[PDB]
């Protein structure tokens, strides 16, 4: 039983992990939505250039 | 530069529109951020249970 | 309830960036607005 629980505990922690995991993906897209944006603004002065 | 004054007229319309635009828009955020504070309260709630 | 304040964070992290974005582009417009003085 108590191997059993400790088992839980664990996954339970890890299914935590993932969650913050997603949330990085959010923001790991939302500065990269515009962060390359950005350099195709740069892009924008290069044709400036 | 009639033309030019009513288009710089127009653009500080424009830009009025955005301000309020953005007024509104971090007034939601404020309340979503009450909203969030009102959750974290609850869940020390939770957490005292 | 956890699960649900994260929801509420994350949709709380889009809008601020969403309204970032909207007074970015409310300050450009401002900013264009320098040739009024002519």
Same mark, same amino acid.
């Given at each position: 039983? $108590?191997? $059993?629980?400790?088992?839980? *505990?664990? *996954?339970?922690?890890?299914?935590?992990?993932? $969650?913050?995991?997603?949330?990085?993906?959010? *923001?790991?897209?939302?500065?990269?939505? $515009?962060?390359?944006?950005?350099?195709?603004?740069?892009?924008?002065? *290069?044709?400036?250039? | 530069?009639?033309?030019? =004054?009513?288009?710089?007229? =127009?653009?500080?319309? +424009?830009?009025?529109?955005?301000?309020?635009?953005?007024?509104?828009?971090?007034?939601?955020?404020?309340?979503? +951020?009450?909203?969030? =504070?009102?959750?974290?309260?609850?869940?020390?709630?939770?957490?005292?249970? | 309830?956890?699960?649900?304040?994260?929801?509420? !964070?994350? !949709? &709380?992290?889009?809008?601020? /960036? &969403?309204?970032?974005?909207? /007074? /970015?582009?409310? !300050?450009?417009?401002?900013?264009?607005?320098?040739?009024?003085? /002519?």
């Amino acid at each position: 039983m $108590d191997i $059993d629980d400790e088992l839980n *505990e664990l *996954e339970t922690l890890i299914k935590k992990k993932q $969650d913050e995991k997603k949330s990085s993906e959010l *923001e790991l897209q939302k500065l990269v939505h $515009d962060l390359n944006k950005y350099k195709s603004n740069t892009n924008n002065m *290069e044709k400036i250039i | 530069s009639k033309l030019f =004054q009513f288009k710089l007229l =127009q653009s500080n319309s +424009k830009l009025a529109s955005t301000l309020e635009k953005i007024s509104s828009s971090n007034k939601d955020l404020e309340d979503e +951020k009450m909203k969030f =504070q009102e959750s974290l309260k609850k869940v020390d709630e939770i957490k005292a249970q | 309830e956890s699960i649900n304040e994260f929801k509420s !964070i994350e !949709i &709380e992290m889009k809008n601020k /960036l &969403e309204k970032l974005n909207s /007074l /970015l582009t409310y !300050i450009k417009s401002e900013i264009t607005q320098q040739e009024k003085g /002519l």
